[PDB]
Structures are given as C-alpha cells and as structure tokens.
Amino acid sequence: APPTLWSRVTKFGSGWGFWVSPTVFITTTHVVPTGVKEFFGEPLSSIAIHQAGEFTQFRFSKKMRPDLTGMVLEEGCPEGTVCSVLIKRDSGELLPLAVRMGAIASMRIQGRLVHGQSGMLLTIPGDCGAPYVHKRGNDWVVCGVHAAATKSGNTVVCAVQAGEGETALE
Amino acid sequence: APPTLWSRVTKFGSGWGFWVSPTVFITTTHVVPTGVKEFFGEPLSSIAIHQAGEFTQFRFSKKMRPDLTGMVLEEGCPEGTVCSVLIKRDSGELLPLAVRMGAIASMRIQGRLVHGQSGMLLTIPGDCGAPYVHKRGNDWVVCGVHAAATKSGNTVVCAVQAGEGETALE
Ligand SMILES: [Cl-]
Ligand SMILES: [Cl-]
Ligand SMILES: [Cl-]
Ligand SMILES: [Cl-]
C-alpha cells in the first residue's frame, strides 16, 4: 500500500475510518462516538449518514479531503481474494495484515447480526474501522471495514455495505 | 473507451444512463420517466433515489449488473480536463465526443438552475444522460451526465453530483 492510501486511514472515535473520496468516509458502526453534534467539525445535519449493521458511511457536504482522488468501494470481494487490512496503531505504527477472504454472510457476533465477510489471517479491538483493501491492476479497491476477530485461531471479519446477491449467503 | 465501458451506457427513459457499479446507475433528471412504479423491473421502494438538480442516482437493492466492477464517480473534473462523452444513438451507433471541460457552476438553463460543468466540444437532445468520462492511469473515471448543449457554437453541459468546494463557482 502506498503512502497516499495509508493517509486515508484516519483516527475516529474508539477506532479508525477511511476516506474513500474527498467527501465520503467509511467506518465500523461500533466505533462511532456517541452523543456528539458533529464529526470532523461538521454538524450532523450537513452529513448524509448511512448505517447498516456494522457498516457506516458519511457523505459530507464540505470537501474534507480535496487532496484525494475518489477510489472504488465494493461490497466485499470474491471468495479467496487476498486483501490487506491497513491497520494504524495509536503510536503511529503501520501494521498491514494479509488476509484471505471467505464468505459474505449475516453472522451473529456479540449478540448482534453483522452483515460482513470473514477471512483468515495469513489484530486488537482498537483496530476496528481499519479498511480491507486489495489491488486491482494499478489501483486499489476498498471492500470492508474491520469489525471483529476471534479470540484465537486467526479469523477476522470486515463489515461490508448492505446488499444481497447470488454470491453471498442469504 | 473499451467495450465494457460502453456496455455501462444504457437506454433509459427519454435518454440514457450509466452503470457506475452493479447497483449504482446515474442519469440526467429530465430524462427519468414520469408516472412509473419501477425502474428496470425494480419497485421504487427498493431503490435509494438521490436527485439534485439535473443529477439523478439510483442505488438498487438487487445487483443489476453483477458483471461490472465498481468505478469512480467524481463531482466534475479540473478546468481544462479533456473528457469523452460516451454517446449511444437509438440505432446503435457510438459517437464518442471529445470535450475540454470548463467551470463548475450553478447555471440557469431553460428556466431552471442546474449544478453542472460546461465544456467545449473539440449532440442531439436524445443524448441526455450520456456519461462524461476521462482516463486516469489505466482506468476510467465518470464525472457527469449530459444535460444541455447550445443551439450552436460548441458548448455542452454535464450535470454533476451536489457538492460545494473551493474550485467551483459558489
Ligand atoms: Cl505493494
Ligand atoms: Cl479534489
Ligand atoms: Cl482509447
Ligand atoms: Cl460483482
């Protein structure tokens, strides 16, 4: 992952989020701060906030990152796709983790149904919101945000956009 | 423009629209058929319909074009960018037109304020909805939908997504 791609990964709430474009930010629902009247200084009424399970998207009225090109956001990826989870730590450390993605499904996690994609590491709770990306040609695609990990044994889950289709369970 | 890119350009209402991804379709507001209860066989309540001036986006619940990758949709492009307007005609003829893009502004056109970008051809009314695209590296970006042309003298306008910013007038 190049520096500019890492620059999209952004501290947010109790986790992280990701600038898909100058105005679009995605993150994991459970890290979104509660009881606030603005995000990044913008009043809530100036933001189109779309939340479905553990997937949250903000579309700001203001260009927040005019330095960035738009990039492609997809609903997960095909079985077996190798992605990178672009984890930043509070210290500043970068920890890109390779993951081989599995099935898209609605999965019960900590009492809630979560629409997401599981994968096997080839994480810590503070990492939630980190993007799952993969390279397509010379460009990068984002396809989920980090939502859960097993206590051991190398399974992770990213939340993905809402959407039903023939390749997903359901 | 490659065949797959052309394949996204789709007859719609009194004009055309464009598949940005398997679920996202953009078109020009004035070509959207009136008094219907579905688009492409999908009931309106199953679609997230976002309309701002002459820019209309549909996000379907069903994957309508699962053959397609997502591609980047931006709000217009920098001054001077050479785009291609991917015009299909009812006969099947392809007529890609080169255009050098100008200012993004809210412009009065036929009595209505239209948020769009003007450009100079380097069209017919039935062409409305055709995408304005430009190549970035090895990939293509869409940045507007055809909305208007001057009676002569080689000016065109594409509608663009809502959004204010330092490079646009307003
Ligand atoms: Cl690399
Ligand atoms: Cl920009
Ligand atoms: Cl070419
Ligand atoms: Cl697909």
- Which tokens sit at B45? 């309540």
Min Cα–Cα distance to chain A from B150, Å: 30
Q: What H or E segment, with its residue span, contains residue A7?
A: helix A3-7
Question: Which CATH homologous superfamily contains domain B71-170?
Answer: Trypsin-like serine proteases (2.40.10.10)
Provide the β-strand partners of residue A27: A17, A56
Min Cα–Cα distance to chain A from B17, Å: 19
Min Cα–Cα distance to chain A from B86, Å: 21
* A145/B24 Cα distance (integer angstroms): 20
Rg over CA atoms, chain B: 15
Domain boundaries, given as residue ranges, for chain B: 1-70, 71-170
Taking CB atoms and an 8 Å limit, are A164 and B61 in contact across chains?
yes
A81 touches chain B (CB under 8 A): no
Closest CA to A119 of A143, A94, A95: A143
Burial code (b: 16+ CB inside 10 Å, e: under 16) for B29-47 equals bbbbeeeeeebeeeeeeeb
Nearest chain A residue to B68 by CA distance is A74
Same CATH topology for B1-70 and B71-170?
yes
Portion 109-138 of A in contact with B at CB < 8 A: 136-138
CB neighbours of B55 closer than 8 A, spacing ≥ 6? B26, B28, B29, B115, B116, B144, B145, B159, B160, B161, B162
Provide the β-strand partners of residue A116: A105, A159
Residues of A in contact with B166 (CB under 8 A): 63, 66
CB contact at 8 A, A65 and B65: no
Residues of B with catalytic function: 30, 54, 128
- Which tokens sit at A108? 């019960």
Method underlying the structure: X-ray
Right CATH for B1-70 from 3.30.70.370, 2.40.10.10, 1.10.287.90, 3.40.50.300: 2.40.10.10
Min Cα–Cα distance to chain B from A152, Å: 34
User: Measured over all CA atoms, what is the biggest interatomic distance in chain B, rounded to whole angstroms?
Assistant: 43
Portion 8-37 of A in contact with B at CB < 8 A: 21-23
* B18/B108 Cα distance (integer angstroms): 25
Ligand 4 mean position to B69 CA, how many Å? 6
* A128/A145 Cα distance (integer angstroms): 7
- Ligand nearest the Cα of residue B6 is 3
* A9/A129 Cα distance (integer angstroms): 9
- Provide the residue type at A135 as one letter: K
Taking CB atoms and an 8 Å limit, are B66 and A164 in contact across chains?
no
- Ligand nearest the Cα of residue B1 is 3
Output phi, psi for B110, to 5 deg. Answer: 50, 45
- Which tokens sit at B65? 């074009």
CB contact at 8 A, A5 and A86: yes
Confirm whether A54 is a catalytic residue.
yes
> CB burial class (10 A; 0-12, 13-18, 19+) of residue A90?
exposed
* B28/B32 Cα distance (integer angstroms): 7
Residues of A in contact with B165 (CB under 8 A): 22, 62-63, 66
Q: Which residue's entry shows tokens 């003007």?
A: B118
Closest CA to A145 of A7, A18, A6, A2: A18
CB contact at 8 A, B113 and B105: no
Provide the β-strand partners of residue B57: B26, B50
Interface test with B, best of A71, A75, A115 (most B CBs within 10 A): A75
Quote the Cα angle for A70-A20-B156, to 5°: 30
Ligand 1 mean position to A169 CA, how many Å? 31
Nearest chain B residue to A166 by CA distance is B63
- Ligand nearest the Cα of residue B133 is 3
